[PDB]
């Protein structure tokens, strides 16, 4: 695309949502991130945006006097409550669960993952760029295991409205999941500070990128005047890690009863069973918590 | 003069009235430490009585299969079953004092919450448990070695007395400072078979605070009638998932009677475990 002799920026691989999960996972392993085009259908993504739009209108845009604050970005996590399309269809992506199993699920131990968050992230016009970071920084000890550590968290980060370089599409650093040392990206700790090359995740509505918690990234500057850049972050963690949202305590049981068993597991309405040499996480005295809740 | 001069020397003891800094210093040195009278004598007796009808309804497995349920009863509904547990035992200021030093960072509130409230009662004849570190439950933790942060700690309280014969836990002090944290088996542990233990001999109300990095295991209960009953207060970093879904099983009535700090321990109160920017205690009806 660029004239010969031009520097070539890093490559984000792209696959259709009809590609095999093995093909997409291979790219995720090589680079730490990969675009899945059509992850959500344009009709599903439009119904979702319409369904969460009243709640987004009620959230005020926060403007502050520190640019390093990551302001002018609306954030909304009650996707299940607000959106039938989200809870009936979006969280039922088999391709999403196929990839989560290839990341998180251990032999004969059931689902190895659950939801960390379901966040609509709408970056307002003029919002400053977000600091470069790894998402596993949320679990502060994880970087110390280096690239040899297991996965903490992954994110299916979906374009709800278009992602462009101008409106603040996430800037990603492919291959940063393989750097020898994982530090915070600051002047004191990161030798490459200020010299780190990123690439934007350009996406159409319904596209998503799957991104390892080991990948350096940061929301871009929204340099536009009118583009509210809407995203949906499906953040998925190991079953042994604590979620950012107490979904089982805020999502009503009426909606829990309508969930598939794997979706109840995702939100903590149903337990999981790990094997330690010769134990339930999130259980109830040896039983699945789903018994006590009436979920059978 | 603690062992005969010339002999090989083979676990410090403090009273609950001692300072948390003194108990924590020994905890840092050895990875475990006894706190005598951690729960008052009348409290542990009320507790034991209060959970005895729960324990009598637990059938005993006689399996010879080598897992931790072979002739060992385990029960986790201590808040539901015991007023003494939820009203007094969990409201120990020292427990929180020590939890703050293990887990909390300045300006960030409580850095810890409950993993489990488990009554463990080793039945007569139960084989000894496998040697393990409690942080094996979070399976990547050993890979960080002794430089890694603290994962889980356990206030392991004697409910009936612990003897060398009825199955008192065998501890390996200082195993939190070994250079490699491995599984403790013949295949993975070069020191297997030569690992030196000390038993945790305790009266009712005593406990030992143990680090999740310390190797240990329950002993064989070679007796005929002694059901060695224990109470394990497993506490984890706030970033880690509990083994019990306490905020879904403990009724809202009892949560309303908890202090703000106990609500946080059970997840009735929230960073992590929030509700779309707000404390989950708001939606639950727990903030004034
Ligand atoms: O909004 C974006 O594009 C990035 C958001 C993000 O990376 C985060 O919130 O951790
Ligand atoms: O019962 C004991 O003495 C030890 C039990 C224990 O360590 C466990 O179940 O994790
Ligand atoms: Fe991020
Ligand atoms: Fe143990």
Residue numbers in the entry:
A (entry chain A): -2 to 275, 278 to 295
B (entry chain B): -3 to 6, 9 to 268, 279 to 296
Authors' account:
EDTA-treated PrhA crystallized well under anaerobic conditions, and we succeeded in solving four X-ray crystal structures of PrhA at 2.1–2.3 Å resolution in the apo-form, in complex with Fe(II) (PrhA-Fe), in complex with Fe(II) and αKG (PrhA-Fe/αKG), and in complex with Fe(II), αKG, and the substrate preaustinoid A1 (5) (PrhA-Fe/αKG/5). Here the metal cofactor, αKG and 5 were introduced into the apo crystal by soaking method. In the complex structures (PrhA-Fe/αKG and PrhA-Fe/αKG/5), αKG, the facial triad, and a water molecule form an octahedral structure with αKG chelating the iron in a bidentate manner and the water molecule bound trans to His130. In the active site, αKG interacts with Arg72, Gln127, Thr167, and Arg226 through salt bridge and hydrogen bonding network.
AusE (Mr 35,100 protein, 314 amino acids) and PrhA (Mr 35,121 protein, 314 amino acids) are very similar (~78% amino acid sequence identity) αKG oxygenases that both accept preaustinoid A1 (5) as a substrate to form divergent products through dynamic skeletal rearrangement. Non-heme iron and α-ketoglutarate (αKG; also called 2-oxoglutarate)-dependent dioxygenases are widely distributed in nature, and play a major role in diversifying the molecular scaffold. This superfamily of enzymes employs αKG as a co-substrate and Fe(II) as a cofactor to couple substrate oxidation to concomitant decarboxylation of αKG to form succinate and CO2. AusE first desaturates at C1–C2 to form preaustinoid A2 (6), followed by rearrangement leading to the formation of the spiro-lactone in preaustinoid A3 (7). In contrast, PrhA first desaturates at C5–C6 to form berkeleyone B, followed by rearrangement of the A/B-ring to form the cycloheptadiene moiety in berkeleydione.
